[PDB]
């Protein structure tokens, strides 16, 4: 697994294991300059001694470590070394192996700091923001279905615009009827109250529920109207899907008791809590 990175911290740990004892003897390198207030200075010595206990903690750190070992030792890395002398002038690639990573890592910061944009204007510098091809919808559908344990379906019986339905662990399916590219004008229900497979005769609208999911529907509409980025509609629908995923539990109830109202949910901050409080 990825627990190997934990060993990195362990490295720093044993580093202190050295420094600690140095900080001990350095503290013994000189005596009382001028206490004049108390004799805790000597205790200060023992204070450094206390940090030596940290070393024992290092031994404890190995209890959580050693999850399991992976097969095929050496992880296909030194296979290039098995080549003849002709292959040895190849380490460069391995360097790039880190470099590329750094690249990503650099972007990992850069893109992050790209969040604070400076686009004083976005028009009068040019188009067709509505996606022409009726194939990018299927692309977005497949990208969403790439997510596990969350099934998505779509029929689009109305026309050019997009129509889709999504289901989760509960029967709280969500019907989203939006334009070509970005999600807008959706609704949610629960327990066959919509039944948008063959409701009456087709995927009906019915604009209703028993006064429980209505707040969730309004919040999802707000999230759709708020996450409408100027570009990258795929990012928009992915953010929408991630937001929708946050209701798969409906179990916790922080910053209040589980008796304030019918339910509780408003996670635009990537964390749900008691509703009617933000």
């Amino acid at each position: 697994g990825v627990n190997l990175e934990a060993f990195s911290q362990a490295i720093s740990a044993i580093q202190a294991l050295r420094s600690s004892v140095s900080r001990v003897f350095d503290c013994l390198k000189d005596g009382m300059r001028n206490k004049e207030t108390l004799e805790g200075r000597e205790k200060a010595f023992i204070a450094n001694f206390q940090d030596n206990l940290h070393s024992v903690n290092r031994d404890l750190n190995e209890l959580e470590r050693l999850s399991n070992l992976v097969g095929k030792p050496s992880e296909n890395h030194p296979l290039h070394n098995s080549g003849l002398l002709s292959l040895d002038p190849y380490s460069q690639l391995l360097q790039a192996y880190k470099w590329s990573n750094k690249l990503q890592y650099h972007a990992g910061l850069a893109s992050g700091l790209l969040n604070q944009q400076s686009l004083k204007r976005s028009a009068n510098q040019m188009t067709t923001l509505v996606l022409p091809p009726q194939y990018v919808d299927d692309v977005i559908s497949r990208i969403d279905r790439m997510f596990p344990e969350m099934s998505i379906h779509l029929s689009r019986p109305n026309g050019t615009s997009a129509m889709l339905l999504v289901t989760l662990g509960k029967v709280l399916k969500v019907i989203v009827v939006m334009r070509s590219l970005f999600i807008d004008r959706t609704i949610v229900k629960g327990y066959n109250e919509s039944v948008y497979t063959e409701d009456g005769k087709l995927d009906i609208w019915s604009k209703s529920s028993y006064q429980v999911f209505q707040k969730v529907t309004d919040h999802a509409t707000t999230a759709l109207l708020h996450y409408q980025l100027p570009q990258m509609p795929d990012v928009v629908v992915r953010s929408f899907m991630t937001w929708l995923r946050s209701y798969i539990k409906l179990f916790q109830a922080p910053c209040q008791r589980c008796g304030k109202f019918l339910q509780d949910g408003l996670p635009p901050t990537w964390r749900d809590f008691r509703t009617l409080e933000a």
């Binding site: 509505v130 109305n158 026309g159 050019t160 615009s161």
Partner: protein
């Protein structure tokens, strides 16, 4: 014959929707255009 005329309206209906679609595009194509006027 009924089935026949069914098609006669069915595609027609679709055509209307297609019209709407086009109109919708045109609709949008003018909405931003409505923004420009600083009257």
């Amino acid at each position: 014959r009924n089935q026949q005329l069914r098609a006669l309206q069915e595609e027609c209906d679709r055509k209307l929707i297609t019209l709407r679609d086009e109109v919708s595009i045109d609709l949008y194509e003018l909405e931003e255009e409505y923004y420009s006027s600083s009257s």
